[PDB]
């Protein structure tokens, strides 16, 4: 029993010791379609400037507070800030013209239901950069990082009342409803895509 968990945990622990998970993949550090000119970086939260963390928290709250209150979770600043600043947090940040932060993902390498996973805790875009393919590109980066670290899936939570995001994940990206989702036994679904 412990042996199976140890092999899973070894892979997670190794991924969490990486320096730049995108070092081998420079093609994914630029997104220049549909009028954008973005550079993308992957850093641990400890590598981000405090003002960048503030921008990311504020964007999450602007985009999500109402939908959190419409869910059973509610929104509390402290809980979300603690989640976003946990030492285990990794970030993909998209910088328009390499200068203005316009989108991010907070993700982790973790164990979920006994499996090594890349868990996507946030994908958040400023309104002006939406519907230009950047969100899809960021999720493709997550899928690539999951593969390169030997994770078994990318996983995330989406509110049922977040209709646009639900269609983005289920239809455009063909994520499945994960077996851990409440619907497979609530205001959200747990979605995943196997590596």
């Amino acid at each position: 029993e412990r042996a199976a968990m140890d092999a899973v945990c070894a892979k997670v622990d190794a991924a969490n010791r990486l320096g730049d998970p995108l070092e081998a993949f420079p093609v994914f550090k630029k997104y220049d379609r549909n009028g954008l000119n973005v550079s993308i970086e992957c850093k641990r939260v400890s590598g981000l400037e405090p003002a960048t963390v503030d921008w990311a928290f504020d964007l999450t709250k602007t985009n999500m507070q109402t939908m959190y209150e419409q869910s059973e979770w509610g929104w509390k600043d402290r809980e979300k800030r603690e989640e976003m600043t946990d030492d285990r947090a990794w970030y993909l940040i998209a910088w328009e013209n390499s200068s203005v932060p316009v989108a991010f993902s907070h993700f982790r390498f973790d164990v979920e239901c006994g499996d090594e996973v890349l868990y996507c805790y946030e994908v958040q875009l400023e309104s002006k950069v939406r519907r230009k393919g950047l969100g899809k590109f960021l999720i493709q980066i997550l899928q690539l990082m999951a593969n390169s670290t030997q994770m078994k899936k990318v996983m995330l939570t989406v509110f049922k009342h977040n209709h646009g995001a639900y269609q983005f994940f289920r239809e455009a990206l063909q994520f499945e409803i994960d077996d851990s989702s409440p619907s497979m036994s609530c205001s959200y679904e747990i979605l995943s895509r196997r590596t």
Partner: peptide, 5 residues
């Protein structure tokens, strides 16, 4: 957004 059960 977030991590449900």
């Amino acid at each position: 957004s977030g991590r449900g059960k």
